[PDB]
Design an enzyme around this catalytic site. Structure first.
Site, PDB file in Angstrom:
ATOM      1  N   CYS A  81       9.903  37.742  20.005  1.00 37.74           N
ATOM      2  CA  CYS A  81       9.772  39.020  19.481  1.00 37.74           C
ATOM      3  C   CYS A  81      10.477  39.327  18.165  1.00 37.74           C
ATOM      4  O   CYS A  81      10.106  40.139  17.421  1.00 37.74           O
ATOM      5  CB  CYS A  81       9.897  40.139  20.632  1.00 37.74           C
ATOM      6  SG  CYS A  81       8.728  40.217  22.014  1.00 37.74           S
ATOM      7  N   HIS A 131       1.501  44.961  16.484  1.00 37.36           N
ATOM      8  CA  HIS A 131       2.607  44.102  16.808  1.00 37.36           C
ATOM      9  C   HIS A 131       2.284  42.599  16.774  1.00 37.36           C
ATOM     10  O   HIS A 131       2.238  41.993  17.804  1.00 37.36           O
ATOM     11  CB  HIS A 131       3.157  44.578  18.171  1.00 37.36           C
ATOM     12  CG  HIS A 131       4.493  44.042  18.595  1.00 37.36           C
ATOM     13  ND1 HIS A 131       5.458  43.597  17.743  1.00 37.36           N
ATOM     14  CD2 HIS A 131       5.009  43.889  19.827  1.00 37.36           C
ATOM     15  CE1 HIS A 131       6.510  43.214  18.419  1.00 37.36           C
ATOM     16  NE2 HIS A 131       6.264  43.377  19.690  1.00 37.36           N
ATOM     17  N   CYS A 149      13.856  44.374  19.992  1.00 43.96           N
ATOM     18  CA  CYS A 149      14.027  43.862  21.291  1.00 43.96           C
ATOM     19  C   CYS A 149      13.110  42.655  21.347  1.00 43.96           C
ATOM     20  O   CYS A 149      12.194  42.579  20.597  1.00 43.96           O
ATOM     21  CB  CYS A 149      13.663  44.872  22.383  1.00 43.96           C
ATOM     22  SG  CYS A 149      11.932  45.343  22.487  1.00 43.96           S
TER      23      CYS A 149
END
Lengths: 386, 380, 386, 385
Positions: free
Chosen positions: A86, A343, A372
């Site tokens: 991520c 994303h 995160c």
């Protein structure tokens, strides 16, 4: 210290959308090349590159080097591909900061890239055979990218768990989602993304020219009523397709240099890296994470910070952070976030840092960017934008 | 100064493809080594400030394999982690950690490599958007791990190219492989790999490397060359595909001192090199000039045996006496779990040098898209 | 006008992934077709047509019976089709009998084949794509061959339903299963399967004995087995046949042609019956077929010298005992499919064959061969053996 | 003893990934068999058996013919079989003819079905494993359906081989192709397919027309087309059909049973011929099948009113000219597979029915339907009433 000399991203594409034909390595090369063009730095001079990528499957050997070669960097530039889920796009920048600080380099290229559209499907029993009875056709994007390795649940499950834990209502998530979209659409219209974005142009199949120069995922046109009527996605929960970003295609890069090197070459940097933080937590605590730790090390309160970027993995994350951090939401993701912009998991980290930089146009100051990542890791970077 | 010391080191046995470790995942192999290294280090997971694990083909391994391995090793959720990809990966993990320590960001770190070639998945590139007409069932190990993204050939092709350019005969290559096998077998029997191997545990126990074949030149001369009719590389002079992991507990020289740790080695320096794809020799030289050193000053060398062709090209480039070079054998005999070999060479050099109450060593590795990584070590 | 069986042959039956693993369904077919012709003393040039049963044809190419026919040395001029009815091997014979009785042919080759070991897995998401989330890697053998299209259940489920419906105990099934193994071992040991068996020789090997027959088996071992595809069922891996490889074939002629050529027929097909029943009633389907056949022919069970009832499950034969009223000593005398395997498109061929050969050996008379098949179909043949 | 065709129906033919994409073959099959029963005025309870042709059965589940029959409303009592011969759709009819003539039944339902859009891909290395190195994701439609088992080539290669062996130029093939669309367009427009076609309705939707007919064709667009499967070839995307979705079925009876029930049959089956040839002789097989059927029947080519020869390739009809010597004005008068598509399992069924309905609208009589099939011939002579 380390300074950011340049920053560029590609526009972010929708899954199976506008960048569908373009490989992750291709998006990476483009941003890496453009970042070098902005800094007025030749590839010959780069001492190394790090590119984040979450799901590397089927992209070939060392995707980071493939991008660096596309970018116009010589074989001489050392290269490595990083996976911190991520957080990868941003962990790359910090890692490069670490290299410079250790005195091993003065000019580095750092970033993130992802082509969710091109992640392949897998046949787990293909090698040794399934022998008898049905087997799986594993979607590696879901498995390697969006699925927790410990709790074995879709990431949205952690999003829900956070919503429950911090008593974050479905409506408040929905409202946040609306804000991401409205703030993005306005930012884009006003051209606030011009500084960060470089277009993707290619000659496609059949001779077709292609130009993608703006972010695909922004919904115009959306409303609270529309968001409210969505069904929850991976739990019959508060997380829906509305209040979580989708899956996307994109990339971003930075030219990083020591403060000394930038000075000698007479470059006027975009910002300086004051420092960074990392956190680790039980898998279900994805939302929590890091900014607080970063502030404490630097003798700073939330008040000292001018602007923050917190990746919108879910609305529940930003909102969880509000309870944890205590920042004022009006200072937070001022031009929208992942919910509206998408994303591409490898690239998100690069974008938020980058965006934050360009916004702090305010003849600005102190910014904080945080993300995160899978398995409850948190990464935070403090910047002084000039 | 500050400088990085290797406090501890451990590795698993290296299994054959579909062999003794076939059922054990790479995260599992990594967890064991990461755990053992901490045990040998006399350090608790709770005090580790970070972990970096090399892994080449991450496909189907789940989110963040280093973290999976780290959790399996007993480290708490608080320890940050990553997953890295460079052939060189095992060893790039140690050097990257060395940079973090030198950057003054941490004092205790765990670094290593892991690879389970046995468990790398096949892929269906047309599955998501759809295939009329036949498509491919792609072998990701070959594709992501063993194929040059630039020249679209198998790595052995590069190996043959080196043989052609440096004029390395099929016969010399075969001689090196035989040598690799004999020294390794001798070393296994003399128990030299014991300091570094940690066993992996219907109970099963795997305590020994599986790839050594005991045998000679005659047999090797008979083998067909693999990705060339006309090539010099063969299944015999090149390693197979394998399963393994290795890891290190690394500290600042200062931190080890504070704790009363007597480290195995101090890492003096490192170099990286890059080159056109058809091209670790240049790396070593670079490392040596920077350190005001020459070939003579070094006690021993570990150069990974990607191919017999590789070490032999290096001799021509570096000029070491092969007597100081892969003394307990190499990858040709021991196997090549690509993400892990980098950890093994460093470790196994450190251990041999130690047995000799020895001194300076150089570990070097070649990797895809012609990159090179070398490390300079003072072993205590 | 009647149909006589001039010759018959089968390959040994291989275990799943066993001795015949590398041999394709058609090749197995070509061999039985060749042997059958040779034994009959007839040239392929003289065949008026061929029909081969084959159940899971996927991946074996265009017209498998024709591939097998060519492999058998049959010329191009001979017409061929591939038949799909568990009853395919028998139905191929009955279909051929109808053809002769229509006066369309005087010499035909009929049979059935299956290479269960060679059935491919499929990817139903492959053509149009999976898009996002996991798909299936579907086992065609189980799907097409072993799964009920109507109830969406494995055939073992219907076997169980039958046991519950007719109150056949787990112990009776096990005793029957055990008897099959005991009798198959005995027959083989005495050379009883030599008349039907032809060997399969090839370089990649010699295969000439039935693979699945167990000698170290007992009630103790059988009773310990877990139930399959149910928890709480009475069907087990033991009392049900496995999946298998094999082929069987026949040379058929009008009675007049065989006489005209001076052939000694093995048997005369007196008649046949087919039945269809609701999906769950697979077991009953064959018994009902035998009763229909007997009524039509002026016969009672007492009039039949021997019965072959394919052992899809031990529950099936026992179910037929309840419906037909035969004496279990006049049934499957040298064992059945539980013992020798069930290569699905080929079982129907074997049972007829082996009924024929047993009765011969007895200087024998009247026989009935019955087989149940998927979607609850029943097929029975009455033979007068000479 | 003879066999009569009491009724006939087909679904429209859908383009690959087209209007019927979402309909499984068994379902296409179920609709046609129900309609044939309704048209014949016969109850499913009275049916003595069924045969459904089907080429690529893979992934369709156990006994696709039986799945179709239940969907058609036939009871569990009716015996069923699934058959594989290109020719499968026609052969199911002839097979049934042989059962009626054997005096084994007086009422049968025969046909074919195919859903090319729904044929799955396969993993041959899936069960036992690929081990190492790349393997194949095999397209079963192409592999099992459209590739010669013996010569290992696409059927179009046989298509080429004939054109060449018989000197049928690219231009001749193209004229035929244009002709197939032109005629197909004309009949469809005038309601000529109305008798045979039965709509496909499904809530997910209505399909009642053939999807593949290309109005807007021309000889310069046909000539511009690139050869397929051979760079030096003459078969193109234009002069051969694509891959299609469809089904067709018939209600069959003995002549006596039909008379007993008051049915007035559409046609009587006079006889049939079956031919076998070397694999590359695909085009010749139906031609040889016809000549054999005419001769065995005391007939000459001049004796036939109308011919249906399936358009596997334009090359096939043209080769059949040479062999049989018919006048083309009597051949495929309402177009063919080039225009209509070729759901391989059902094409044989379509051709027989289209022929019967055409002969019938002319109040006419003698017809021959012929088809080539993989591995190289089926022909049927009918008396249309």
């Amino acid at each position: 210290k380390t300074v950011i000399v340049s920053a560029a991203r590609t526009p972010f594409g929708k899954f199976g959308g506008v960048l569908k034909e373009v490989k992750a390595a291709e998006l990476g090369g483009i941003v890496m090349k453009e970042a070098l063009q902005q800094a007025g730095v030749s590839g010959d001079d780069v001492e190394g590159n790090v590119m984040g990528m979450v799901v590397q499957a089927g992209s070939g050997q060392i995707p980071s080097r493939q991008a660096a070669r596309l970018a116009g960097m010589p074989w001489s530039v050392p290269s490595e591909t990083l996976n911190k889920v991520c957080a990868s796009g941003l962990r790359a920048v910090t890692l490069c900061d670490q290299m410079i600080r250790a005195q091993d380099a003065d000019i580095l290229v750092a970033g993130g890239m992802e082509s969710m559209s091109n992640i392949p499907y897998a046949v787990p029993a293909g090698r040794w055979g399934a022998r008898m009875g049905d087997g799986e056709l594993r979607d590696l994007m879901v498995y390697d990218g969006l699925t927790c390795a410990f709790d074995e649940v879709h990431m949205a499950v952690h999003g829900n768990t956070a919503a429950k834990e911090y008593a974050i209502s479905r409506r408040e998530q929905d409202e946040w989602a609306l804000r991401s979209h409205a703030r993005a659409a306005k930012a884009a219209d006003e051209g606030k993304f011009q500084d960060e974005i470089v277009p993707v142009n290619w000659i496609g199949r059949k001779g077709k020219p292609n130009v993608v120069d703006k972010d695909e995922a922004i919904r115009r046109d959306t409303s609270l009523d529309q968001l409210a009527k969505l069904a929850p996605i991976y739990a019959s929960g508060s997380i829906t397709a509305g209040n979580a970003p989708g899956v996307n295609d994109g990339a971003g890069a930075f030219v990083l240099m020591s403060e000394e090197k930038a000075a000698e070459l007479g470059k006027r940097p975009l910002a300086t890296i004051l420092g960074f933080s990392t956190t680790g937590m039980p898998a279900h605590e994805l939302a929590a994470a890091a900014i607080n730790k970063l502030l404490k090390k630097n003798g700073l309160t939330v008040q000292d910070i001018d602007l923050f970027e917190v990746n919108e993995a879910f609305a529940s994350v930003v909102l969880t952070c509000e309870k944890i951090v205590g920042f004022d939401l009006e200072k937070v993701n001022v031009n929208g976030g992942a919910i509206a912009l998408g994303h591409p998991i490898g690239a998100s980290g690069a974008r938020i840092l980058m965006t934050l930089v360009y916004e702090l146009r305010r003849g600005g100051g102190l910014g904080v960017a945080a993300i995160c990542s899978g398995a409850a890791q948190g990464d935070a970077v403090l910047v002084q934008v000039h």
